[PDB]
């Protein structure tokens, strides 16, 4: 079984999840990638080659067609903004891209939506950027300082060309830590860290018009949170997992936010006892949520911090 971490990435093609990097209380091997058979509950450990990432925590990746695709992320020296992909359809071999265009600024705890041939990054924490958006520097990095954005990037994959949209509406603020679905055109982000708030609104950018919408659920909301995760589990539903309020609590919930209804339902599972934050979160084609790693309490305090390795299981 895979060593225990949190800020570690982890992808799926809804049958084995590929997971990668993160940290323990010292980074996890860059060469190694752990791939987990969502149908028999078994792990496999490969070591891979080529231009293989540094280690790092918060970093930001996806998987197409079995490609997985890897953008930011901290290591032993800072933020970074490198792009690698790794075909995982013989021993894998990284590939850094050189892209072409502007790139985002080094970062890392951001989200990625997926539509079509693009790429589409927002939000982060790094350095100052110049580039389409805000940044607001974090005042406690002073005393390489950094801060939050709201930059929306493209990476077209038809030609690994960085662009920026022009949107129109109100973009969510500069943040880090929320969490990102996409189903159908919509690119839904939820909460995440900005100044010193752990935010509750949900918002969609509008894929085809670069259009951002915010969503006003009626009734009972989620409290505010960071390093939840946000998954889409049906062309109808997310599914919102654990996390870590303003007040510093380590959150267990679990949430189904119907799209076409536009309403939250709180979900009961067996793992009330199980907060997590940084974990990741992957759907499986049977409709089920696999959880994997993560913070049981705050890992600010990382002499205590109790990372797991636990695979959780949502049947949503
Ligand atoms: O404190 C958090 O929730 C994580 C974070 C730190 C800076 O930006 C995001």
Redesign the pocket.
């Known amino acids: 079984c895979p060593a225990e971490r949190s800020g570690h990435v982890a992808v799926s093609d809804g049958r084995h999840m590929f997971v990668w990097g993160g940290y323990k209380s010292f980074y996890l091997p860059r060469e190694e990638l752990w791939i987990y058979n969502m149908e028999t509950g078994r792990w496999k450990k490969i070591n891979t080659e080529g231009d293989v990432p540094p280690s790092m925590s918060g970093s930001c990746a996806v998987c197409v067609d079995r490609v997985l695709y890897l953008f930011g992320g901290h290591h032993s020296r800072g933020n970074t903004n490198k792009f690698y992909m790794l075909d995982s359809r013989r021993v894998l071999q990284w590939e850094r891209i050189d892209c072409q265009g502007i790139p985002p600024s080094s970062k890392d ?1 951001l989200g990625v939506w997926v539509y079509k041939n693009k790429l589409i990054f927002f939000g982060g ?1 790094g350095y100052l950027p110049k580039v389409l958006g805000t940044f607001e520097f ?1 005042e406690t990095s002073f005393w390489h300082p950094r801060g ?1 954005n709201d930059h929306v990037h493209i990476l077209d994959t038809e030609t690994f060309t960085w662009s920026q949209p022009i949107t129109t509406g109100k973009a969510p603020s500069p ?3 929320h969490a990102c679905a996409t189903v159908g055109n919509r690119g839904f982000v939820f909460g ?2 900005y100044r010193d708030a ?1 935010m509750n609104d949900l918002h969609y950018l509008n894929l085809d018009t670069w259009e951002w919408n915010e969503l006003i659920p009626q009734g009972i909301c989620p409290v505010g949170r ?2 939840h995760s946000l998954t889409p589990v049906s062309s109808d539903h997310l599914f919102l997992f654990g996390g ?1 309020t303003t007040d510093k609590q380590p959150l267990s919930d679990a949430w189904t936010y119907c799209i076409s209804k536009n309403e939250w339902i709180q979900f009961n599972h067996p793992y009330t006892e199980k907060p997590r934050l940084w974990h990741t979160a992957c759907a499986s084609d049977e409709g089920e949520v696999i959880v994997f790693g993560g913070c049981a309490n705050n890992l ?1 305090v990382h002499h205590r911090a109790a990372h797991s390795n636990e695979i959780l299981i949502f049947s949503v």
């Open positions: 705890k924490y974090d939050w943040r880090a830590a995440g860290r752990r960071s390093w870590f600010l």
